Amino acid sequence: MIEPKEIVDPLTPDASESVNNILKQSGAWSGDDKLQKWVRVYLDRG
Amino acid sequence: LWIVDLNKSDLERLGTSWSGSITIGDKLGVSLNQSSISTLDGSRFIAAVNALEEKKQATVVSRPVLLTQENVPAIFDNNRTFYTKLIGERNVALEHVTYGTMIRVLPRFSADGQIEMSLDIEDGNDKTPQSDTTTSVDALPEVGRTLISTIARVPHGKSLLVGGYTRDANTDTVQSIPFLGKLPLIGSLFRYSSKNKSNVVRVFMIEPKEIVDPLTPDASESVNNILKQSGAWSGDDKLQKWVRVYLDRG
Amino acid sequence: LEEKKQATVVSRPVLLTQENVPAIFDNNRTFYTKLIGERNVALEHVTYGTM
Amino acid sequence: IRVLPRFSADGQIEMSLDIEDGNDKTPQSDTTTSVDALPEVGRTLISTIARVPHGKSLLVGGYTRDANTDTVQSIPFLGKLPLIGSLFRYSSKNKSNVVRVF
Amino acid sequence: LWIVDLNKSDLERLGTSWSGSITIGDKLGVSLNQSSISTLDGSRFIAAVNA
């Protein structure tokens, strides 16, 4: 089968809230660590 | 960009399957299910039951980051090899999977503030027939190869999808004996049922952002918080400081 | 011997472009399944390609 | 690493980067701690011009990864009775999470 | 330039997995999990635990 659709809008909600609902529920969240947060924090908000 | 994978599968196997032969007085030989009498004369008929089931679930989320100027190309690619510990040190073996990634882009600015880019991306492992033992494939999940070739524009600081793949599947079979598999009392001792079900999504996202500022705090304070807490700091040594000090402050 | 077999599989790719520009998507996963036995060891596998 | 730098007017530096780092893919270190002794880092390659103000530090590219794995292998009938039903399980979790940035 | 790496992993493995076969009076043979009787007649069923 086939079906296209037109798209003009960004994703709602945002992608940074999608994966942070994945990683805190699949059991792989890695922001608690006080050894690795010193270099992820350069990398999440700019 | 955001790689993301979700895998989920369960499988069950239960039932018997019979074979073998009998004999009567060296005058007649009755065999069940292709058991040749030319290999067996008194070996009576046997059975085989299978019982095993499981539930598998695995996720993997990875992301590359890279910056350019506008109207200039750039390439990023990467491939690590992930090992896992097969059980045994003298009875020795290993198994390993390479995990490759590639991305090249060509961005520009618009008038109203949105970014337009030019994407070829790749991700996956190479097809390797390996990990022969049952949990050896279970240790490291597999993700297939993929390739996009797409220009796509997106408003400032927000996230748009660029392509994906989903898949759902079942399987059902009931293998049995024709006459004796329907009587109510022990008729379900002659079944052989094996369901199977897996369902997998995988999608590539993208989001750019504009950047004008240097990193806050500085990088020399980042690694000096790493090395004094991971336990590898090397400024205490009175034999090696005489040449690192030419090298930290100019 | 007799049996009854039934199987379904439903898959979908998604992708976007602009208008009047080409684009390619292709994919191939390999699906393993657990043959019964760990020391009596064997596997079997099928690649599933899409373009 | 190869580079090609120049000065700007206001004091910032603009450079031209191709960098590489890693080991070559070697199937080796067969014993269990032999891989554990020396860690592995994958190959990487950048091709980027990037400018940065004087004396401060800017990021040029990186890679992170998170993963799980869960499986519960058991016997269908006898794996649910309360008394010794958990003697027929086979559970094996797995979890790794790795960052790396230039 | 500054290379930096952080790696972290943990892994656990626990449980059993069974196999083997029995016999009754040289008249019938019941086997669990692909144990062929064509290699074994009196070798009773075994287990394997990993921890």
Author numbering:
A (entry chain O): 512 to 557
B (entry chain N): 308 to 557
C (entry chain O): 359 to 409
D (entry chain M): 410 to 511
E (entry chain M): 308 to 358
Paper text:
The injectisome is a specialized bacterial organelle that utilizes a type III secretion system (T3SS) to translocate effector proteins from the bacterial cytosol directly into a eukaryotic host. Composed of >20 different proteins, the injectisome forms a syringe shaped nanomachine that spans both bacterial membranes and that of the infected host. The major structural unit of the injectisome is the basal body, composed of three highly oligomerized concentric rings spanning the bacterial inner membrane (IM) (PrgH and PrgK in the Salmonella enterica serovar Typhimurium SPI-1 T3SS)3–6 and outer membrane (OM)7 (InvG, a member of the secretin family of OM pores also found in the type II secretion system, type IV pili system, as well as the phage assembly system). To address this and further elucidate the structural basis for injectisome assembly and function, including that of the central needle component, we have conducted here a cryo-EM analysis of the assembled native needle complex resulting in 3D reconstructions of the IM and OM rings at resolutions permitting atomic model building (3.6 Å and 3.9 Å, respectively) and the 3D reconstruction of an isolated helical needle filament at 3.3 Å resolution.
The density in the core region (InvG176–557) showed defined secondary structure with the majority of side chains clearly visible allowing for unambiguous building and refinement of the structure including significant additionally resolved and structurally changed regions from the previously determined closed form. The most dramatic conformational change upon needle assembly is in the inner β-barrel. The open position is stabilized by intimate packing against the outer β-barrel of itself and neighboring monomer i + 1 (monomers defined clockwise looking down from the OM), and extending vertically toward the lip region of monomer i + 2 with a dramatic increase in buried surface area between the inner and outer β-barrels (2111 Å2 per monomer compared to 1153 Å2 in the closed state).
